[PDB]
Amino acid sequence: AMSAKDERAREILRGFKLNWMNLRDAETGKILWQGTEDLSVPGVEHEARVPKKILKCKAVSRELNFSSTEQMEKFRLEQKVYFKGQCLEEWFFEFGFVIPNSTNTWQSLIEMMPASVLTGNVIIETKFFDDDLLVSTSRVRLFYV
Numbered sequence: 335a336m337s338a339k340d341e342r343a344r345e346i347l348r349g350f351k352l353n354w355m356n357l358r359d360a361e362t363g364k365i366l367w368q369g370t371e372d373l374s375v376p377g378v379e380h381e382a383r384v385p386k387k388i389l390k391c392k393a394v395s396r397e398l399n400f401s402s403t404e405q406m407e408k409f410r411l412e413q414k415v416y417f418k419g420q421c422l423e424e425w426f427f428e429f430g431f432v433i434p435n436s437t438n439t440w441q442s443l444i445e446m447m448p449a450s451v452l453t454g455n456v457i458i459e460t461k462f463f464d465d466d467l468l469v470s471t472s473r474v475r476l477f478y479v
């Protein structure tokens with residue numbers, strides 16, 4: 335007993351997949367982190383170990399490679415950054431239209447505390463949308479190594 339929008343969300347998600355993601359120091363271009371696991375799955379608790387060095391980056395370039403079986407009118411993300419239950423930062427990134435059964439690459443440019451304190455204390459709540467239709471919600475805990 336599920337809505338029209340509920341069914342469209344169900345379809346998109348099932349037909350969606352995160353292939354890989356990299357993180358480069360915008361300044362140099364040196365890849366600081368490449369992820370293989372799909373961190374877009376809701377319900378699961380993901381974790382990530384990222385090099386401490388990154389916290390001394392003024393800006394970082396984040397590339398996502400994903401595959402969607404379903405067509406999407408405007409694919410965009412909302413991300414809140416939580417420290418010990420307190421939201422510190424919110425961000426919005428748009429990819430736009432997605433071709434059905436396409437594999438797309440998405441590069442976003444992103445413009446401070448001690449690593450000892452942040453490590454394991456930071457959660458990145460990620461909402462996936464088609465235009466203004468919430469398809470999935472993901473939560474990733476970050477560690478600085």
Ligand SMILES: c1ccc(CNc2ccccn2)cc1
Pocket residue numbers: 373374382384458460472474476
């Ligand atoms: C989906 C897409 C992108 C992110 C971004 N989170 C991360 C993950 C690892 C390191 C830094 N940030 C989370 C979920």
